[PDB]
């Protein structure tokens with residue numbers, strides 16, 4: 001979900017449900033995850 | 040018996056994974072306002088469609 005946020009530091013108060021995007025039929029066991037950046 | 044022959048072999052397999060490979064499935068017409076059977080992409084039943 002991509003929603004507008006007021007100019008604030010902390011997470012806002014309220015409700016915003018998250019619509020689904022995709023499900024993938026992979027069937028691989030997962031134990032760890034990371035993140036990627038652009039430089 | 041000595042002329043060239045082209046051969047193709049097809050193999051299949053199953054395991055603990057989603058199928059993700061299936062053949063065609065055909066759709067009939069759509070009727071309304073009649074007590075009819077229906078199979079709408081996996082759910083079955085009987086009733087009147089409006």
Ligand SMILES: *[C@@H]1O[C@H](CO)[C@@H](O)[C@H](O)[C@H]1NC(C)=O
Pocket residue numbers: 027028029030
């Ligand atoms: C993923 O790893 C776990 C822990 O080693 C194992 O129990 C599970 O069978 C694995 N999943 C496979 C092989 O699909």
